[PDB]
């Protein structure tokens, strides 16, 4: 209950913050560029094509 030294719940929260941040960054980059494919990371074979 009164956990010691470790607020496990806060740790758990941090991960969801990370996930949302990653999605937002992707969306902003795509929105700015005007391209769904800013690098081979987005869509490799499609990038080549």
């Amino acid at each position: 209950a009164q956990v010691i030294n470790t607020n496990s719940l806060s740790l758990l929260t941090q991960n969801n913050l990370n996930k949302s941040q990653s999605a937002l960054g992707t969306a902003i980059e795509r929105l700015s560029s005007g391209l769904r494919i800013n690098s081979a990371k987005d869509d490799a074979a499609g990038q080549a094509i």
């Binding site: 030294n5 607020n7 806060s10 740790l11 941090q14 913050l17």
Partner: protein, 49 residues
């Protein structure tokens, strides 16, 4: 290069804020406990009035 350097240098505010909170509570609770600890031998004196 800017991104790469940042991942080495910068601090994540969430992590350090959480650490700060942990340390704050630890300090407060510990000081109260210490007060009681010092009062202990004074209770032994309470045997010895």
């Amino acid at each position: 290069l800017t991104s790469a350097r940042s991942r080495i240098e910068d601090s994540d505010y969430a992590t350090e804020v959480s650490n700060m909170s942990r340390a704050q509570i630890l300090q407060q609770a510990g000081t109260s406990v210490l007060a009681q600890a010092n009062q202990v031998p004074q209770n032994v004196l309470s045997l010895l009035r």
